[PDB]
Write a protein that binds this DNA or RNA. Structure first.
Length: 58
RNA sequence: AUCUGGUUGAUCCUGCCAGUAGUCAUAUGCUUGUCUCAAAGAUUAAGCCAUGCAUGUCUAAGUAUAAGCAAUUUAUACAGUGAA
């Protein structure tokens, strides 16, 4: 409507997982046919102590 | 491959009732030191049941971004192990 809601209209929770199938990635970026996809994959970083690692899907 | 006691004052018979041994055949009574081997809720009620267990499973080789761990390092797709 017109007014705002304190917990329901203000925040934005981000999604948990990007795409995995190769054609299903090119849909998400709108890339063309002749483009390599394996340089266009979302990566997630995680660190315990001082070890910055990288999770990335197969 | 065997027989003995009992009918009459006495004797020969027909005849059955005691006796006598066996049982991987069950209980029961009094006793009971050793080695080996061992059945065991069938009979009566295929009656009733407290609690716990008895069916789950992975290799180099179907699916891992665990906000798992190991970090260890050639590896920017992923590659070690590995819950759900």
């Amino acid at each position: 409507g017109e007014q705002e809601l304190e917990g329901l209209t203000d925040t934005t929770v981000p999604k948990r997982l990007g795409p995995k199938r190769a054609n299903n990635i090119r849909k998400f970026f709108g890339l063309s046919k002749e483009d390599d996809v394996r340089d266009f994959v979302i990566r997630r970083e995680v660190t315990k102590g001082e070890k910055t690692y990288t999770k990335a899907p197969k």
